[PDB]
Write an enzyme that holds these catalytic residues in place. Structure first.
Site, PDB file in Angstrom:
ATOM      1  N   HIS A  37       0.817  -1.215   0.000  1.00  0.00           N
ATOM      2  CA  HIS A  37       0.000   0.000   0.000  1.00  0.00           C
ATOM      3  C   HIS A  37       0.855   1.272   0.000  1.00  0.00           C
ATOM      4  O   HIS A  37       2.077   1.206   0.046  1.00  0.00           O
ATOM      5  CB  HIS A  37      -0.910   0.008   1.222  1.00  0.00           C
ATOM      6  CG  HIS A  37      -1.862  -1.148   1.305  1.00  0.00           C
ATOM      7  ND1 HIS A  37      -3.099  -1.249   0.660  1.00  0.00           N
ATOM      8  CD2 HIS A  37      -1.671  -2.244   2.095  1.00  0.00           C
ATOM      9  CE1 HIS A  37      -3.637  -2.396   1.101  1.00  0.00           C
ATOM     10  NE2 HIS A  37      -2.800  -3.007   1.950  1.00  0.00           N
ATOM     11  N   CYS A  84      -5.253   5.326  -1.584  1.00  0.00           N
ATOM     12  CA  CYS A  84      -4.127   4.480  -1.914  1.00  0.00           C
ATOM     13  C   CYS A  84      -4.192   4.093  -3.397  1.00  0.00           C
ATOM     14  O   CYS A  84      -5.086   3.348  -3.788  1.00  0.00           O
ATOM     15  CB  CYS A  84      -4.280   3.317  -0.962  1.00  0.00           C
ATOM     16  SG  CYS A  84      -3.149   1.943  -1.234  1.00  0.00           S
ATOM     17  N   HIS A  87      -5.638   0.985  -5.042  1.00  0.00           N
ATOM     18  CA  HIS A  87      -6.911   0.537  -4.471  1.00  0.00           C
ATOM     19  C   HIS A  87      -7.980   1.639  -4.372  1.00  0.00           C
ATOM     20  O   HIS A  87      -9.107   1.362  -3.966  1.00  0.00           O
ATOM     21  CB  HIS A  87      -6.639  -0.058  -3.086  1.00  0.00           C
ATOM     22  CG  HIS A  87      -5.616  -1.166  -3.078  1.00  0.00           C
ATOM     23  ND1 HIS A  87      -4.529  -1.273  -2.205  1.00  0.00           N
ATOM     24  CD2 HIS A  87      -5.592  -2.211  -3.956  1.00  0.00           C
ATOM     25  CE1 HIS A  87      -3.866  -2.377  -2.587  1.00  0.00           C
ATOM     26  NE2 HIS A  87      -4.482  -2.954  -3.637  1.00  0.00           N
ATOM     27  N   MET A  92     -10.585   2.098  -1.615  1.00  0.00           N
ATOM     28  CA  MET A  92      -9.698   2.533  -0.541  1.00  0.00           C
ATOM     29  C   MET A  92      -9.417   4.040  -0.576  1.00  0.00           C
ATOM     30  O   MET A  92      -8.400   4.493  -1.105  1.00  0.00           O
ATOM     31  CB  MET A  92      -8.397   1.730  -0.574  1.00  0.00           C
ATOM     32  CG  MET A  92      -7.539   2.137   0.628  1.00  0.00           C
ATOM     33  SD  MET A  92      -6.278   0.957   1.155  1.00  0.00           S
ATOM     34  CE  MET A  92      -5.832   1.763   2.698  1.00  0.00           C
TER      35      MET A  92
END
Ligand SMILES: [Cu+]
Length: 99
Positions: A37, A84, A87, A92
């Protein structure tokens, strides 16, 4: 606040996904599950008095083991979407706000 990238492994998300801060405080972005990440502030929705290139990670810098971290002292009173980039479309996204 330590924003937890990888909500319990079974939610590909932060915890918290919305929070607020004061100016001059520090956000700590840390891994939990589902690696790798990073954190990227969204260049179209950040406040005007900054550049995301001072608060996002670099495009090829990512947290790839469990315990890795990224950190930032943040300022300027406004909304702070950071997500992120692998994602963010998968959902995310986080909303810090300096208030
Ligand atoms: Cu991610």
């Amino acid at each position: 606040v330590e924003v937890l990238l990888g909500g319990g492994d079974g939610s590909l998300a932060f915890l918290p996904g919305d929070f607020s801060v004061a100016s001059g405080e520090e956000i700590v972005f840390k891994n939990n599950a589902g690696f790798p990440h990073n954190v990227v502030f969204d260049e179209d929705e950040i406040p005007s008095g900054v550049d995301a290139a001072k608060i996002s990670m670099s495009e090829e810098d990512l947290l790839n083991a469990p315990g890795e971290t990224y950190k930032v002292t943040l300022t300027e009173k406004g909304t702070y979407k950071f997500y992120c980039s692998p994602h963010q479309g998968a959902g995310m996204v986080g909303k810090v706000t300096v208030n």
